[PDB]
Amino acid sequence: SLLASACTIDLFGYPESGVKFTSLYFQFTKGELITGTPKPFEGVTDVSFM
Amino acid sequence: SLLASACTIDLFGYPESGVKFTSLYFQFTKGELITGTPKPFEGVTDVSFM
Ligand SMILES: *[C@@H]1O[C@H](CO)[C@@H](O[C@@H]2O[C@H](CO)[C@@H](O[C@@H]3O[C@H](CO)[C@@H](O)[C@H](O)[C@@H]3O)[C@H](O)[C@H]2NC(C)=O)[C@H](O)[C@H]1NC(C)=O
Numbered sequence: 001s002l003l004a005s006a007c008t009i010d011l012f013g014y015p016e017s018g019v020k021f022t023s024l025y026f027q028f029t030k031g032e033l034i035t036g037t038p039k040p041f042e043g044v045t046d047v048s049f050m
Numbered sequence: 051s052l053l054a055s056a057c058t059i060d061l062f063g064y065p066e067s068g069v070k071f072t073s074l075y076f077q078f079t080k081g082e083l084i085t086g087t088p089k090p091f092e093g094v095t096d097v098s099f100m
């Protein structure tokens with residue numbers, strides 16, 4: 001659904017005459033608390049590494 | 051319908067309280083192959099002229 005102050009990602013299909021499947025609205029703000037990691041961590045007491 | 055990566059031309063009417071009749075979505079890329087000429091050519095073996 002539409003969120004205030006959000007950007008949109010439009011998902012399309014070409015079935016073989018394309019259609020729009022859905023519109024994903026992303027509402028977000030910047031900072032450190034939430035991180036989009038590629039996967040869950042396992043056996044991890046401290047997520048950070050280097 | 052909506053096309054991915056397309057521009058829109060909105061067609062409106064004022065009937066005498068206006069309405070939008072339709073939205074035309076244009077999906078295109080640049081180059082030489084397809085040309086929007088004003089009309090068909092007749093008796094033409096070579097479309098180009100100068
Ligand atoms: C930032 O500094 C902290 C503190 O030194 C680093 O955390 C330390 O990370 C090491 C390596 O994972 C931990 O050692 C581990 O201890 C556990 C038992 O608790 C053991 O099972 C593992 O084999 C390993 O020896 C250490 O506990 C941990 N120290 C603390 C107090 O957090 C951290 O790694 C640094 N940041 C980054 C980028 O990793």
Ligand SMILES: *[C@@H]1O[C@H](CO)[C@@H](O[C@@H]2O[C@H](CO)[C@@H](O[C@@H]3O[C@H](CO)[C@@H](O)[C@H](O)[C@@H]3O)[C@H](O)[C@H]2NC(C)=O)[C@H](O)[C@H]1NC(C)=O
Nearest residue numbers: 082083084085087090091092093094095096097098099100
């Ligand atoms: C780019 O150069 C080509 C090649 O010279 C030009 O094409 C030539 O155009 C002339 C004029 O239309 C053609 O002459 C015509 O011949 C037909 C019979 O085939 C005849 O019925 C007409 O009365 C006229 O005499 C000629 O055939 C044609 N040559 C070839 C091989 O394409 C062309 O005009 C040039 N590009 C542009 C911008 O026109």
